[PDB]
């Protein structure tokens, strides 16, 4: 209450900030001709 | 009355001839106000169209939403039937309840030839439907560069 928050906000923040995101790849398919680099993009991962 | 409508829907010629030869109302309308000419134009039975027009079928009959046989034929690309209807007095600028004209419908499908025929017969190129749209607007929205020119 002191910060004008509720459990809804807590739940929303946990779902947004403890998240495992699929983010594709550098040089992912179908690629541009002459691409030299292919790497997974790693974005948010679950908290531990 | 009803035998004519389904005969014209089925595309069964001699039947239709026997039914005016036996006195069937050429202007008989089903529950949505479609006449044998509507049905023949819709499905594309050119010869049937000629026979009902030869027999006094209202070329400008409209259904319960204001649409005429020319609308149906323009919409679905039946070029020869568009020509026939037009030679028999089809109102080239008839509007349905939405403001939509045969030119709008033919434009919306890309039937370039029908569009030229309708124009040759005096289609109002600036006629607007209930949303303010003309056949030109339709061609732009569709990306049809060929049609957008003619209009």
């Amino acid at each position: 209450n002191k910060f004008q928050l509720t459990p809804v906000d807590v739940i929303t923040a946990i779902k947004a900030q403890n998240a495992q995101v699929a983010a594709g790849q550098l040089g992912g398919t179908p690629p541009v001709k002459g691409q030299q680099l292919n790497a997974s993009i790693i974005a948010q991962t679950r908290l531990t | 009355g009803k035998k004519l409508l389904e005969a014209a829907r089925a595309g069964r010629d001699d039947e239709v001839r026997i039914l005016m030869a036996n006195g069937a109302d050429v202007n008989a309308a089903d529950v949505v106000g479609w006449t044998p000419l509507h049905l023949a134009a819709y499905w594309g039975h050119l010869e049937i169209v000629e026979v009902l027009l030869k027999n006094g079928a209202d070329v400008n009959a409209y259904d319960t939403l204001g649409s005429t046989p020319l609308h149906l034929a323009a919409h679905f690309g039946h070029l020869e039937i568009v020509e026939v209807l037009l030679k028999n007095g089809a109102d080239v600028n008839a509007k349905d309840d939405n403001g939509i004209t045969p030119l709008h419908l033919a434009a919306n499908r890309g039937h370039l030839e029908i569009v030229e025929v309708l124009l040759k017969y005096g289609a109002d190129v600036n006629a607007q439907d209930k949303f303010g749209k003309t056949a030109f607007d339709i061609s732009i929205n569709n990306g049809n560069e060929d049609l957008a020119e003619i209009l």
């Binding site: 398919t29 179908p30 | 929205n141 569709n142 990306g143």
Partner: protein, 48 residues
């Protein structure tokens, strides 16, 4: 069809102009994914 997807209306601008999907994207029939290139004697192939 690609033509119908292209005329999806994204936005109507202030001046009344229209933003369509084909104004922000190329639109084509393609594969569901592009991770595997298959060739039979160097020619494009599918199979079973």
């Amino acid at each position: 069809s690609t033509e119908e997807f292209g005329k999806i209306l994204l936005k109507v601008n202030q001046d009344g102009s229209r933003v369509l999907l084909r104004d922000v994207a190329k639109i084509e029939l393609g594969g569901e994914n592009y991770d595997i290139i298959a060739e039979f004697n160097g020619q494009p192939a599918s199979g079973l």
